[PDB]
Design brief:
CATH superfamily of chain A: PDZ domain
Largest interface: A-B, 17 and 11 residues
Radius of gyration of chain A: 13 Å
Order of helices and strands of chain A: EEEEEHEEHE
Subcellular location (chains A, B): Early endosome membrane; Cytoplasm, Cytosol
Number of helices of chain A: 2
Modified residues (Phosphoserine) (chains A, B): 12, 23
Shape of chain A: globular
Structural class of chain A: alpha+beta
Oligomer: homodimer
Strand content of chain A: 35-45%
Domain PDZ (chains A, B): 4-96
CATH architecture of chain A: Roll
Largest sheet of chain A: 6 strands, antiparallel
PDB class: protein binding
CATH topology of chain A: Pdz3 Domain
Protein name (chains A, B): Sorting nexin-27
Number of domains of chain A: 1
């Protein structure tokens, strides 16, 4: 289920890489057993960076950026939204990797 | 725009799968808003393999293999070019997925 994560920008920026469609129009995909228009995803998280500390996970699919639903958005639209926040970022993500404390 | 990627072969080979026309002659296709004769594409990248580490992306369309333009080539022509290099591979690819560091 979609989860919300806050990241405060450090010196290394937010500390993650985003990957996804350069253009609009990709076909619908099945993510966590449900259909979405194409999502950008977290392709890497800088170990020790802000996103890692905040609990962003490699493979997280990005559903919202600072309250804006970015389902089927272009890569540039999403990265521009992230970069428009100069200190904080709120993501809603569909994680392909779960986490539990034991 | 076409980008260049180097991959050094590991134990798992280069660590990706190639898909594309078995025979020559497919019709021109529109890729990233431009016309090309049929391209082979990266259908999967082995997570943790050499291609993943080098930054090859699932969906990358293969424009050149070790300096050879393979626009409209057959699948076997392209795979033979890849395999003729026993340690290194240079690809020029048109990525359907962009990546940015934030």
């Amino acid at each position: 289920s979609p989860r919300v994560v806050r990241i405060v920008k450090s010196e290394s920026g937010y500390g993650f890489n985003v990957r996804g469609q350069v253009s609009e129009g990709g076909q619908l995909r099945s993510i966590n057993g449900e259909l979405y228009a194409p999502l950008q995803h977290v392709s890497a998280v800088l170990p020790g960076g802000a996103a890692d500390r905040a609990g962003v996970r490699k493979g997280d699919r990005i559903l919202e950026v600072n309250g804006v639903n970015v389902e089927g958005a272009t890569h540039k639209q999403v990265v521009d939204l992230i970069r428009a926040g100069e200190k904080e970022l709120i993501l809603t993500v569909l994680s392909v990797e779960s986490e539990s404390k034991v």
